[model samples]
Target chain A: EIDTLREEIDRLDAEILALVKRRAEVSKAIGKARMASGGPRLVHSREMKVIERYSELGPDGKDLAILLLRLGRGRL
Target chain B: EIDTLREEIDRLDAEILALVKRRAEVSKAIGKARMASGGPRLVHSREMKVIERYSELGPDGKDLAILLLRLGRGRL
Candidate 1:
């Protein structure tokens, strides 16, 4: 039934949430390390490549990259 | 095999990507309407409830909320 599909999606969401959270934690650690090394927060050039990679998929790619960065780095 | 599970995840990611894109477009429209009505770009109270809903699941809930908002509403 459609309910089964919904359940599956929910499970997938949970898994994806876990992955995103893991990545975010790693990103936070990287941000701190960069700061310690006297690097600025929000590396636009790196993010530009990230955006380009995903944006190739569609316009939503930019938004996806933005959300990922926000999750990883905290705010702009 | 593990490969099967990996394949399933890839398919799920595609579906999730589509859903996020759709949600973002709708949110963008809402943002534009709010701006035209002279309201603020972000409705913090609404987002607070959203964060609370997901946060109940785990510590990553806050990050999830942040990601969703960025995907939907763009930069702060």
Candidate 2:
């Protein structure tokens, strides 16, 4: 039924959203540590690799990666 | 190394994004069917269930649910 499908979708949404939030928190901590070690908060090379890794899903994958990064660290 | 972790995150991101897109398409279809059936596009009772399900993750879950719904159906 459509209602059952909706419930399943809700479950998936919650799981993925929680995971994304955790990723953001961990990335934020990493950024802080890097800054403490006199490194920039945002590293371009790393982000480039991330974008490349997401290229498997095509342009939308890259776009989603960029959105994920932004959600994790804010801006470039 | 952090690079390895970043790669894992990228892999997860790609998978989750693809799933989210699929969910959105299905949801869009459901909305269309509901309209054809003379039902409202958004059923408040259904949304309440979704919010409640994600409530297990706390306030952030509710926020995330809103975002997910928006992403899926482009606002209420």
Candidate 3:
């Protein structure tokens, strides 16, 4: 029974890892694209949205969001 | 409501990302520690186990494993 539960957990882990990888790809794409019609200020707001989105996670939510933002930003 | 479901999704995403980050940290630590007395080579098999664990994911699973591996390994 535990093995079955762990299998489920592993699947979830793989799914999450895939999503993170995809997020990094999309972030790189966003960085490459500089042809914006709106104000440059919106970029920061986008990050805040992510932070707020994870605010439900307490401290970890904020920290995790920051980690994700850095992962996508790539070595900074 | 749909918004509630999206909230659940975000929390799940946060949990998954945190786990991945922790895995990376652990991998780095494993790479750091060098204390074994058995065989001279056992590193390659650990990678295979990860790949097999994600075998349930089809091709994306493998790609995800590689990506995480690279992340922990850092850029070349």
In terms of TM-score, the best-performing candidate is 2
With a 3 Å backbone cut-off (N, CA, C), the pairs that clash in candidate 3 are none
* TM-score, one value per model: 0.49, 0.62, 0.46
TM-score of 1: 0.49
Off by over 4 Å in 2: A43-76, B48-64, B74-76
Candidate 1 vs candidate 3: which has greater TM-score? Answer: 1
Write model 2 residue lDDT over B1-76, tens digit each, in one string.
4566566666666667667677677677666667668866554877777777666655655664565565555335
Model 3 has a DockQ score of: 0.07
lDDT of 3: 0.55
Model 1: per-residue Cα lDDT at residue B14: 53
lDDT of 3 by residue, A1-76 (tens): 3334335435646666676666655554454443333336334766788877755545545665665665555333
**lDDT tens digits, residues B1-76, model 3?**
3334345445656666576666655555444442222334234765677766655545545655665555455323
- Model 2, position B22, has a per-residue lDDT of 74
Give a tens-digit lDDT track for model 2, residues A1-76: 6777677677677667677777676666556556657866455777787777666545655665666665566334
Residue B74 in candidate 1, Cα distance off native in Å: 5.6
Q: What's the CA RMSD of model 3 in angstroms?
A: 9.6
